Paper text:
The trypsin‐like serine protease plasmin catalyzes the degradation of fibrin clots into soluble fragments, thereby maintaining a normal blood flow in the circulation. Intravascular plasmin is formed from its zymogen plasminogen after activation by tissue‐type plasminogen activator (tPA), whereas extravascular plasmin, which contributes to tissue remodeling and cell migration, is mainly produced by the urokinase‐type plasminogen activator (uPA), especially when bound to its receptor uPAR leading to an enhanced uPA activity. Under physiological conditions, the activity of plasmin is tightly controlled by endogenous inhibitors, the serpin α2‐antiplasmin and by α2‐macroglobulin. Two series of macrocyclic inhibitors addressing the S1 pocket and the prime site of the fibrinolytic serine protease plasmin have been developed.
For inhibitor 28, a crystal structure in complex with a stabilized Ser195(741)Ala mutant of μ–plasmin was determined. In this structure, six monomer complexes (namely A–F) were found per asymmetric unit. The P1 and P1’ residues are identically placed in all complexes. In three complexes (A, C, and D), the macrocycle (shown with carbon atoms in different green colors) adopts a similar structure indicating a preferred inhibitor conformation. In the three other complexes (B, E, and F), the P2’ residue and the adjacent linker are placed differently. The carbonyl oxygen of the Txa group makes H‐bonds to the amide NH of Gly193(739) and Ala195(741), which form the oxyanion hole. The P1 amino group is involved in a complex H‐bond network at the bottom of the S1 pocket to plasmin residues Asp189(735) and Ser190(736), and via three bridging water molecules also to residues Trp215(761), Leu 217(763), Gly219(764), and Val227(773). However, the biphenyl side chain of the Bpa residue occupies very well the relatively long S1’ cleft between His57(603), Glu60(606), and Lys61(607) on the left side, as well as Phe41(587) on the right flank. The phenyl ring of the latter residue makes face‐to‐face contact with the terminal ring of the P1’ Bpa residue (closest C−C‐distance 3.7 Å), whereas an edge‐to‐face interaction is found between the other Bpa ring and the side chain of His57(603).
Residue numbers in the entry: 544 to 559, 562 to 791
């Protein structure tokens, strides 16, 4: 009974990270915590293969040395990690060559694929997530007084097409075609500090596909200020090349 990508063994709860709700433990088995060698959380990430983790390039601004990074897998807590939690060192860092906010980490050893550690599925190249598509963002980031501090939280957010997101009342032309927007324009529900590099997944047919990587925003959960995510579809060819070649 191998574990197919995108299919959690613990069905994700829905609560239709600031706002949202604490997730069912192990409902997001591709969620990774990027940590200092001393075990401090400072970014999220997504397991896409037993030996590969995808995150935001900005998460690596403090050090270009792989030895400076540790990956936490199968976790729900941020500080009191449970016993089965896998901790794996990084061997090589691969930054996107067009200066985009995405990067791949090759783990020193392959992660053990369990019912609590399963890779996410990648989208088909150039796929454009439709406007209003409900997707989920996950992370151990700040809650801004919304509850769930120190625990893996989730939030279901509608995707906002770039044409709307780039309007003057919103991000005013700051969003690129290699990026996507997601959030409640009314505010209240949004990724926040510590969620960068983490996943934005959408349910497709019977599984979750990685469509976005938490990147940046004008504050968190502010009205008319949706969060910005790197569009994974525009980088699937590059990601597969790196993994096949290295
Ligand atoms: C070692 C290191 C590596 C990388 C970062 C920080 C450190 N930290 C230090 O260098 C000195 N502190 C230590 O060593 C203690 C290490 C442990 N905790 C900390 O630092 C505290 C800590 C501080 C800051 C962060 C994470 C952790 N994050 C961020 O804000 C990252 N944006 C986002 O999340 C955005 C996502 C989208 C959202 C829009 N809705 C807006 C926010 C941008 C970002 C900024 C900094 C880093 C990573 C990402």
């Amino acid at each position: 009974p191998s574990f197919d990508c995108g299919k959690p063994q613990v069905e994700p709860k829905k609560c239709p990270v600031v706002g949202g709700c604490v997730a069912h433990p192990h409902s997001w088995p591709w969620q990774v915590s990027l940590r200092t060698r001393f075990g401090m959380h400072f970014c999220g990430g997504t397991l896409i293969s037993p030996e590969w983790v995808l995150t935001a390039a900005h998460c690596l601004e403090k050090s270009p040395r792989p030895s400076s990074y540790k990956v936490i897998l199968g976790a729900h807590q941020e500080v009191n990690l449970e016993p089965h939690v896998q901790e794996i060192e990084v061997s090589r860092l691969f930054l996107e060559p067009t200066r985009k906010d995405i990067a791949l980490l090759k783990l020193s050893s392959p992660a053990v694929i369990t019912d609590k550690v399963i890779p996410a599925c990648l989208p088909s190249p150039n796929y454009v997530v439709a406007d209003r598509t409900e997707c989920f963002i996950t992370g151990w980031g700040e809650t801004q007084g919304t509850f769930g501090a120190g625990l893996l939280k989730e939030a279901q957010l509608p995707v906002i097409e770039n044409k709307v997101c780039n309007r003057y009342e919103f991000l005013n032309g700051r969003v690129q075609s290699t990026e996507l927007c997601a959030g409640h324009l009314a505010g209240g529900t949004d990724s926040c500090q510590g969620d960068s590099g983490g996943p934005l997944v959408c349910f497709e047919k019977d599984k979750y596909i990685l469509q976005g990587v938490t990147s940046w925003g004008l504050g968190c959960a502010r009205p008319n200020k949706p969060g910005v995510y790197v569009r994974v579809s525009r980088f699937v060819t590059w990601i597969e090349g790196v993994m096949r070649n290295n």
